[PDB]
Amino acid sequence: MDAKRSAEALVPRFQFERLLNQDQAGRRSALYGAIDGQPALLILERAPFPTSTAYLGRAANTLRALTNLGANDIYHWYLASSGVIEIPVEESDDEFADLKINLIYPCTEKHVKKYSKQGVRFVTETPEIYRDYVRPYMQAQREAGRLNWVYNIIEGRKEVEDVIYRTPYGQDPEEGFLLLPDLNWDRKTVEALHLLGIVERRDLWSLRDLKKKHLPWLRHMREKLIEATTKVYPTVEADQLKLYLHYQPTYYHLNIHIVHVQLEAGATQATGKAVGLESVMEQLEHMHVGPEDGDGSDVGMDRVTMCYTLGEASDLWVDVFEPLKRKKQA
Amino acid sequence: MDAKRSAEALVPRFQFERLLNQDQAGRRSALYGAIDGQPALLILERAPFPTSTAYLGRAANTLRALTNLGANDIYHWYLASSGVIEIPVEESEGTDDEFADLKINLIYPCTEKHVKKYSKQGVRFVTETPEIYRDYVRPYMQAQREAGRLNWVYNIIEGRKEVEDVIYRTPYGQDPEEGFLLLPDLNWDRKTVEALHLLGIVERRDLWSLRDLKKKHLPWLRHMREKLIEATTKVYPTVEADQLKLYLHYQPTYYHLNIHIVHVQLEAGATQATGKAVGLESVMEQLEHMHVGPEDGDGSDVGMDRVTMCYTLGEASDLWVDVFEPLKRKKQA
């Protein structure tokens, strides 16, 4: 393993310059620097704790340093440094690791931008702002071809082996769908289940397109997605799943997240990003039908004001909401 | 300093028995065991990385072990173990300290209450129709209030408790309808502005949860939204209005309306998750556009008690044990 030793030789040559970002409760730091006089990006992460009893049964008894910070009755808190614990013969001479390291070298300005801290803003999207600015932006993104990757999966030309369930392409153009594992799921831990329900029809760009006339479709899709998930993973019951939509979505083709209720909630589930599927259905169900609205078929989410988070490097913040904010402050 | 050394002697005597829970993306493990023949609960946490240049400028060059797992062009990924890095004199009160990679909490002797608190808990997603709210859940809320479970809230509202922890309030009694106070969330260190998490406890006592909100409350809601934001940005001048999110819990942990205020940069966890957190503006918009029927008059009493709400419950909670699990059991063949 010359390439393995070669890659290992890079890390001690890293010359730190500055911290780009620290996140994940402080347990991930993105460092910028240089190796051999060229830009280098080194990402430090605390590793998860081992579950081996060889580790858990020895961690408290092998510390290389331990400092009590305070105590109150039966409560005590400390800082400590891990000692060396060797991995037993039947699980590996290795020791248990406390760090994960990613090194991008040589890195570019694109990597610096990607891993630099990005501020977040909470914006207010009225029906007028959706009509005049956001919906035109969505259209341009789709016309530019940004959904090619989605369409390639829907049509069965990519990630065929990653799909865990689908209706065959073309068999059901209105209510067909496929289930894709989320990139961060190990596909083995059922209680961390996270699937993407990508619908086959192509005319719904986001929940903004949903109207009362889509309530039957929404009911059918909710049942079908839950039915398929609990069929593929039979130890999962219906009341152990949550279905939600993103707004703003990360891409402009309606897709329904399916997560196990036991999955640790992160940004993908947070208020200002995730909207429960049943919550959208109830808003359509009870939305007011005015005298000019006929039977109500076209009453829907494009009448609502939606408030949500955006990153400050996003197109929508830079081109729409920051300028609207500046124009209002003048 | 003797008590400091005494508490340090506890940790190496810990005898591991079993893992109670591992969460926070695997970086927190709650271990159950014994010390001196009595139950002990040891919680291991990965520490945040120092920002000190003395640490960051040496971490890559002092590793005590390093294994490359793979590489692809300019991408390389590894596992590693940290070496010893001493804290420089100008950053340490003591001498011969090294940067720490672990935080440890030891509860000893612990009880069954601590084991329950830190053990993994099953979760269920339930469907609360208006009928189930009427027949089962609202009576449960009422009994909780009648039992006195809100004594702690009222003690703070009335200025008998946590007077020193309130970061802002309207003086009690001055504004009975739109008065409020702001309390820091127990999990916030009260100094890191980008992790800000406040609880807005309203002065009025007749709103138990968002189920009580109706169209007639929309002016009150608009006013409270503004007032909570103005007060937060007044106390924390580096926070702008568009760097805050306001939300309600449903189910809430207690049955007196209270509005969470969080910095947009705060990392989202269970408290913000779908099935628990409901954005304040989302409730207001749901009330704004809700249908007013022919028997509803001017619509003033149309509100959230007409909606079906879906949310998560823990399997040890009263509502699961006494309401939703029995309803589920009776329905199943």
Write out key terms for the chains shown.
homodimer; 330 residues; alpha+beta; HIT family, subunit A; 2 domains; 8 helices; hydrolase; scavenger decapping enzyme; dimeric
Structure description:
The structure is a homodimer. Chain A is α+β, with helices and mostly antiparallel strands and 330 residues long. Chain A folds into two domains: 1-118, no CATH class; 119-330, HIT family, subunit A (2-Layer Sandwich). Chain A is 26% helix and 26% strand. Chain A is built from eight helices and 14 strands. Chain A has helices at 2-10, 53-56, 109-115, 127-143, 148-154, 215-232, 277-285, 315-328, and strands at residues 15-23, 28-35, 38-46, 65-72, 75-81, 99-104, 120-125, 165-166, 177-181, 194-199, 241-246, 255-260, 274-276, 306-311. In chain A, the strands form four sheets. The first copy, chain A, has a six-stranded antiparallel beta sheet with strand order 8-9-10-12-11-13. In chain A, strands 1-2-3-6 form a four-stranded antiparallel beta sheet, with helices on one face. Chain A has a two-stranded antiparallel sheet with strand order 4-5. In chain A, a hairpin with a 2-residue loop joins strand 4 and strand 5 (75-81). In chain A, helix 6 runs antiparallel to helix 7 (277-285). The first copy, chain A, is globular, with a radius of gyration of 25 Å. At the A-B interface, helix 1, strand 1, strand 2, strand 3 and strand 4 of A face helix 1, strand 1, strand 2, strand 3 and strand 4 of B. Strand 6 (99-104) of chain A pairs antiparallel with strand 5 (75-81) of chain B. Chain A: It holds the Pfam family DcpS_C. Chain A: InterPro entries: DcpS/DCS2 (IPR008594), HIT-like_sf (IPR036265), Scavenger_mRNA_decap_enz_N (IPR011145). Chain A: Belongs to the HIT family.
